[PDB]
């Protein structure tokens, strides 16, 4: 969008760093420089003493539709997730519409997710013969357990905001026409809270839950690099772009 | 054509592995547990196999150990390790009882499609024994520590519906639809991107199963301790005499 | 009671009652240290097959006192209480009525089974005075309810009802109507009459599976609490609680 | 067993069992009339304190297999259950479909097996609900869920039926038979006259429209069996096809 | 103190009517019910009253009829009728037991705010009696007929959370919030458009209460018969004695 | 014309509330017009289902204008939908408020978007429910939930409405339009005469009080528009402030 650098829009609204994914025309699909740009602003929030909370949202119809340079983009995505979880300040995702593939990992890296009634979470990777990325394989089971994670990954089904909330995937659900006001309420309340105690709470929860994040991210990066060489990905990438149902062979 | 209580057939790209002792409610002994792992190993080597179906013939999926402690323990642990390390999806079609190691067996699989009358139960402590097969490691990353403690300590039957609501299992079926949904899930996963499924499993295994082996070692050691106790003696005796055990904590 | 802890034998059950009802069983270091030995001393006691943990008065436990100025001391003692319960090779049951707040939440959730009264609740109120979770709550909670519901509890300081805690899988048992006492009795009877050695082995396997980060996380919480009491936000939090008004946090 | 119904006494319980398992307890007029008679005769029988209604075989009752006569007899069976001053418990295992649904839901208590289900399958063959189901279901699950069941002819699981308030009791795991047994034992040993009175008061609160609605349903069914849509529906069912409905 | 077991007070625009025989868990007799009726009806002509709050003293909202059958049954019916036809909103603040007529009484009100440990029970048949106050008519248009049959035939306790989830009652509370939610509801309602509420009530009553009087007359007749029965005598004796009644159906 | 737009689409008559700039708020001519098109679906042999939706951001925001006339027209719309011997499906997205709620709930099926909501906002301005909502809602969700809705004027989410049995269908994610399309295709190809009869029976079962109740609501609203609280309610609504109600 106009005024955004590498598809990321950043502004300060008092104590809030407002970061907005800003390629609405591609439903906020991400590439390498957009990911790198995102993580810079996330990292730089730490040393910025006016920032007490980060708000992550997306412009247009969707929060984030996921990845489009396999090694490169995978690394940059993994780094964004790491930057969000290691930032000693609260990061809130406001998720409306689709949160798909890395879009899903991205929301779930955040401390709190406020989900609009029509929003959804989906690992669509397998639909193109690919595997989850961003660390989703580590983030999701500590949210919803192994069996529902395994289902998300293998079936590529959409999980509604209501279901994601019932499963403990996300901290907040909204209903009716209240998405915006609840998001505003949560943001104002968190950005006025004891930021240092939030930081220390994050460090302890990170140790409790993220021990495997980086080894799992390594396996995903390695897997995706192998999977883009397979006959199934070529078929997957072709059948998606043609609005045809793919014919997978296991090769 | 079953061997050591296991039948196997190919149906296109699916290896169908079926526990075949309905005359004993698919209770398992060591030969049967060893036999299972053989076919999981065949699945890995067989280029035509794109998914494994695991079910029990008859009323029960698997009613756990017939009640050679160390050998059974090792065989049970190895079946679960084989299933979770197989880089191809394994679907458990759970009908009726999944009890004791039966429960660990279903929960080892990547997806579980449960019939409405199926149930999941750690009956171990009814006879003075402890969970096995890695159940102590598998259950908490499904349903959390508190519900796992309760299952193990009270030995209550958990219904398919409840197990589904808790996150224990991926799929539930209702009415008379169990077979058709199971068939649908099988057809879908076996025509799916098998290599992407193997990688997914690998990433998820690293995220969730780091303690599986250490925990299985603790369980085998404990079961070996516990079969020596007077409580196990009473438990087994009370089971056979169709009565309530009188445990004393020794 | 000695140091705010009552201890009574009742058949094969060791009953440990937190007994400072005049402060809603808010805890200090003496009280925690006292609690901890009575827990490990149940290992030794051949008559004890189960431990029951409850609180006298209106609340299970309102958590850390905020008196004493013994920050590292309290944090250490609270940590050791939680470790002793998870490590005792005998079942420990929390019967929770009323408030389980701050370390009171950590305490209940360290137990093997929790039987919650209908009006009971679980709450990480620490952040309302600018402090962070303790006892090792940060490691316990995610393996109960997942990371998202934990972050919320810790960051918003909301009360979680007994009913909600049960749905989430935070606690093993829920009661309703006037049935709390009777259900508690039923569960204590059955557990204390159970295969105690089997229970102890089950606990060891389950601790190996779920508590690998308990110690490192407790050390992080203890360092964090030490840093947090020096902050302007804590001075303001404490002052606001004292003056019953809303704190004005600054992030310093 | 006569006209597809077996009746036996087990202490203070009248066990009435739909006994056409080969046809999944599909019903005709003489079966429906047989059923009415024994339900009604439970009243005079001093030794009966509870009526158990179940079906033999795979299904509780698959519904209608002589339109006017069948509708009247089906309507009589329901009035007979609802007005019997003694509790009737339906033990529902498997399918309760069409009139088999109305039959179950007329009972005072319903104990559902986990794989059991409830369905108004009538419109799949171009017909409407009968037995008085159009009156029974809204005072169980409300008008919107009823409209849905009737118009989509979807199967409602026991679990969902329980959650909606359609049925009094759900069972799980392998416990169906035990629970049914405990419920039957408890009800048959209870204060039968108070149950009789409790029923009368409930019937007056809930069943004012029952006979009037039953009359509309009987009239409707007579009209619908003349339609091309019934003609196509009945044949499609027999030939295992999707029916071509045209609204005439 | 109170007159005939009822205490009345004004709190701003709220008339608070309190069941005040805590020693008997607010069990009700004919004079208490007649008093109750008088004060509910009093609200109609008192212009300072914009809402009625009904609560119970002591440990329970109301344990139902004190074990004058005709007199009491008729008086209970008139209490329910006075609540339902009062053109002002009536709120039950229910804590603890609301049993027998105590359930009917709560369920007559326009809104019910239930404390987390409160519960609703039709305990009638446990003493060989039937529901009263119009409960047979009130309950089915709340929770449906099957759940009503169950409540009446089994005399099981329905927790506040379950009653809420069933649509039996308008408001649930949890944790230590009962008093403050109740206060908030009362403030909001008593400061609301009372006349609009009156009319709202009137239309709703015409939609749902058409059977309330005929059903009440059936309950009254039934209780008149049931107290002549052996089963009532066994039920009363066994309740008093804290043991299992042997019912005969006579 | 009169803020209603109509169109045939195969066997579906699409009726769309068409005053998006006012969030489909309704007045007498719009209500009278809506009646006419609902009524004319009966005699139109190409029509097998009616679809009711709203253009713009809201299904229907509900009801200066004449109270007597508008209330009457509203009542007539609700009687028209419920007596039409063809399925009427409301596709509800956004707000269904006041009569907007009545109008949805009058229909045979309702397919609700995930951000949709249902609300009786009347008492917030010192008025009472209308269109027969007082009769419709208790046979959907029970008297307790109805009383709370009417008295508190709170918004009920689509999810909650579905949980409560208020509405037949719920949608989630981006699937609203797809589900609505599928339900309309399946219902418009169904046994339309069977559906007509089913409706008639359901109506006799559940709508006996509809007209007595609609009369009470029409009388009441006429009284309430004369009150000081309505003057205060409408002022406070207009001025985007909190009303100070006094019970006069």
For the domain covering D1-173, report its CATH number: 3.90.226.10
Q: What is the Cα–Cα distance from B106 to B104, expressed in whole angstroms?
A: 6
Helix, strand, coil shares of chain F, percent, nearest 5, are 50, 15, 35
Q: What is the Cα–Cα distance from B187 to B9, expressed in whole angstroms?
A: 16
A190/C132 Cβ within 8 A: no
**Strand order of the sheet with strand C121-123?**
C99-101, C121-123, C160-161
E125 close contact with D: CB closer than 8 A = yes
Strand-pair category, B64-65 with B27-28? parallel
E133 contacts on D by Cβ (under 8 Å): none
Q: What's the token pair of residue F172?
A: 């989630």
A232/B195 Cβ within 8 A: yes
C144 contacts on A by Cβ (under 8 Å): none
The CATH homologous superfamily to which domain A195-251 belongs is: Lyase 2-enoyl-coa Hydratase, Chain  A, domain 2 (1.10.12.10)
For the domain covering E1-175, report its CATH number: 3.90.226.10
Q: What's the token pair of residue F65?
A: 């204008």
Q: What is the Cα–Cα distance from D166 to D173, expressed in whole angstroms?
A: 20
Q: What's the token pair of residue C122?
A: 């679980």
Q: What is the Cα–Cα distance from F128 to F135, expressed in whole angstroms?
A: 13
Q: What is the Cα–Cα distance from B7 to B198, expressed in whole angstroms?
A: 25
Angle at Cα D33 formed by Cα D27 and Cα D38, nearest 5°?
Answer: 110
Burial class (CB in 10 A: 0-12, 13-18, 19+), B19: buried
DSSP state of E124: G
For the domain covering A1-176, report its CATH number: 3.90.226.10
Domain with CATH 1.10.12.10 in chain A: 195-251
Q: F62 forms bridges with which residues in the sheet?
A: F25
Cα dihedral value C216, C217, C221, C227, nearest 10:
50
Q: Are B149 and C206 in contact (CB under 8 A)?
A: yes
Domain with CATH 1.10.12.10 in chain C: 196-252
Q: B91 forms bridges with which residues in the sheet?
A: B53, B111
Chains near E, with 3+ CB pairs < 8 A?
A: C, D, F
Burial class (CB in 10 A: 0-12, 13-18, 19+), E230: middle
Chains near B, with 3+ CB pairs < 8 A?
A: A, C, D
Q: What is the Cα–Cα distance from F69 to F225, expressed in whole angstroms?
A: 13
B13 close contact with A: CB closer than 8 A = yes
For residue D179, CA distances in Å to D113, D154, D175, D185, D187 come to 10, 27, 6, 10, 12
Q: What is the Cα–Cα distance from C35 to C6, expressed in whole angstroms?
A: 9
Q: What's the token pair of residue E33?
A: 């019910």
Count CB-CB contacts under 10 A for residue A178: 17
Burial class (CB in 10 A: 0-12, 13-18, 19+), B175: buried
B116/D174 Cβ within 8 A: no
The continuous run of DSSP H or E covering D55 comes out as: strand D50-55
Q: Is F91 helix (H, G, I), strand (E, B) or coil?
A: strand
DSSP calls for B94-129: E-SEEETHHHHHHHHSSEEEE-TT-EEE-GGGGGT-
Candidates A49, A57, A58; CA nearest to A88 is: A49
Q: A56 forms bridges with which residues in the sheet?
A: A19, A93
- Residues contacting residue F47 through CB under 8 Å, at least 6 positions apart: F8, F11, F12, F13, F41, F86
Task: Count H helices and E strands in chain A, helices first.
Answer: 11, 9
Domain with CATH 3.90.226.10 in chain D: 1-173
Q: Are F83 and F77 in contact (CB under 8 A)?
A: no
E97 close contact with C: CB closer than 8 A = yes
Q: What is the Cα–Cα distance from A96 to A65, expressed in whole angstroms?
A: 11
C206 contacts on B by Cβ (under 8 Å): 136, 140, 145, 148-149, 152
A144 close contact with C: CB closer than 8 A = yes
Q: What is the Cα–Cα distance from B226 to C201, expressed in whole angstroms?
A: 9
C168 close contact with A: CB closer than 8 A = yes
Which stretches within chain C are classed as H helix? Answer: 29-44, 71-87, 103-110, 137-140, 142-145, 147-156, 162-168, 180-192, 196-210, 214-228, 232-242
Q: Are D50 and D184 in contact (CB under 8 A)?
A: yes
- Residues contacting residue C236 through CB under 8 Å, at least 6 positions apart: C130, C247, C248, C249, C250
C146 contacts on B by Cβ (under 8 Å): 144
Q: What is the resolution of this structure in A?
A: 2.0
Q: What is the Cα–Cα distance from D151 to D245, expressed in whole angstroms?
A: 13
Closest-CA distance of chain C to residue B133, Å:
11
Considering CB atoms only, which of C195, C198, C210 is closest to B140? C210
Burial class (CB in 10 A: 0-12, 13-18, 19+), D111: buried
Domain with CATH 1.10.12.10 in chain E: 194-250
Q: Angle A213-227/B194-208 helices, nearest 10 degrees? A: 170
D95/B174 Cβ within 8 A: no
DSSP calls for F38-77: HHHTSS-TT-SEEEEEESTT-SB-B----HHHHHHHHHHH
Phi-psi region of E134 (alpha: psi -120 to 50; beta: other; left: phi over 0): left
The continuous run of DSSP H or E covering A32 comes out as: helix A32-47
Q: What is the Cα–Cα distance from B164 to A167, expressed in whole angstroms?
A: 11
* Candidates 3.90.230.10, 3.40.50.2300, 3.90.226.10, 3.40.50.620; CATH matching C1-177: 3.90.226.10
Q: What's the token pair of residue D40?
A: 């009604």
A150 contacts on B by Cβ (under 8 Å): 110-111, 170, 204
Q: Is A79 helix (H, G, I), strand (E, B) or coil?
A: helix
Phi, psi of D76 (to 5 degrees): -65, -40
Closest-CA distance of chain D to residue B159, Å:
5
Q: Are F150 and F198 in contact (CB under 8 A)?
A: no
E138 contacts on F by Cβ (under 8 Å): 143
Candidates D189, F34, C198; CA nearest to B250 is: C198
Q: What's the token pair of residue B26?
A: 């698919």
Query: Distance between the two ends of chain E, CA-based, in angstroms?
Result: 43
Q: What's the token pair of residue A111?
A: 């401390």
* Candidates 1.10.3720.10, 2.40.110.10, 1.10.12.10, 3.40.630.30; CATH matching D192-248: 1.10.12.10
The number of CA neighbours under 13 Å toward the Cβ of E55 is: 19
- Residues contacting residue F182 through CB under 8 Å, at least 6 positions apart: none
Q: Does the CA dihedral C12-C18-C19-C21 come out positive or negative?
A: negative
CB within 8 Å of chain C, chain A residues 194-223: 194-198, 200-201, 203-205, 207-209, 211
Q: Are F205 and D138 in contact (CB under 8 A)?
A: yes
Q: What is the Cα–Cα distance from C93 to C111, expressed in whole angstroms?
A: 6
* Candidates 3.40.50.10490, 1.10.12.10, 3.40.50.740, 3.40.50.300; CATH matching C196-252: 1.10.12.10
For residue A166, CA distances in Å to A149, A173, C20, F166 come to 14, 9, 37, 21
The CA R_g of chain C, rounded to the nearest whole Å, is 17
Strand-pair category, C13-18 with C5-10? antiparallel
Q: What is the Cα–Cα distance from D138 to D213, expressed in whole angstroms?
A: 12
Q: What's the token pair of residue C248?
A: 């004005």
Candidates F40, D190, A65; CA nearest to E226 is: D190
Task: Count H helices and E strands in chain E, helices first.
Answer: 11, 9
F159 close contact with A: CB closer than 8 A = yes
Considering CB atoms only, which of D94, D158, D173 is closest to B157? D173
Angle at Cα E136 formed by Cα E131 and Cα E142, nearest 5°?
Answer: 125
Q: Are B140 and C206 in contact (CB under 8 A)?
A: yes
Closest-CA distance of chain C to residue A194, Å:
5
CATH topology of domain B194-250: Lyase 2-enoyl-coa Hydratase; Chain  A, domain 2 (1.10.12)
Domain with CATH 3.90.226.10 in chain C: 1-177
């Amino acid at each position: 969008g106009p005024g955004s650098m590498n598809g990321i829009s950043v502004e300060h609204d008092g104590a809030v760093l407002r970061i907005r994914l800003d390629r609405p025309e591609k439903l906020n699909a991400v590439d390498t420089p957009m990911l790198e740009e995102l993580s810079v602003h996330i990292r730089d929030a730490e040393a910025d003493e006016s920032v007490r909370a980060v708000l992550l949202t997306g412009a247009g119809r969707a929060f984030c539709s996921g990845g489009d340079d396999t090694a490169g983009a995978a690394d940059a995505a993994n780094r964004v997730v790491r930057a969000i979880t290691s930032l000693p300040k609260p990061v809130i995702a406001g998720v409306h519409g689709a949160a798909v593939g890395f879009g899903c990992s991205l929301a779930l890296a955040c401390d709190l997710v406020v989900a609009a009634p029509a929003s959804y979470f989906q690992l669509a990777f397998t639909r193109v013969g690919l595997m989850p990325d961003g660390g989703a394989s580590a983030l999701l089971p500590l949210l919803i357990g192994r069996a529902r994670t395994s289902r998300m990954a293998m079936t590529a089904e959409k999980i509604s905001a209501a279901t994601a909330f019932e499963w403990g995937m996300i901290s907040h659900i909204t209903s009716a026409d209240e998405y915006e006001s609840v998001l505003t309420d949560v943001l104002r309340s968190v950005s006025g809270g004891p930021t240092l105690a939030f930081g220390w709470t994050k460090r302890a929860l990170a140790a409790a839950t993220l021990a495997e994040l980086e080894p799992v991210q390594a396996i995903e990066a390695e897997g995706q690099l192998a999977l883009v060489e397979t006959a199934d990905f070529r078929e997957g990438a072709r059948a998606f772009r043609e609005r045809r149902t793919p014919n997978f062979r296991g090769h």
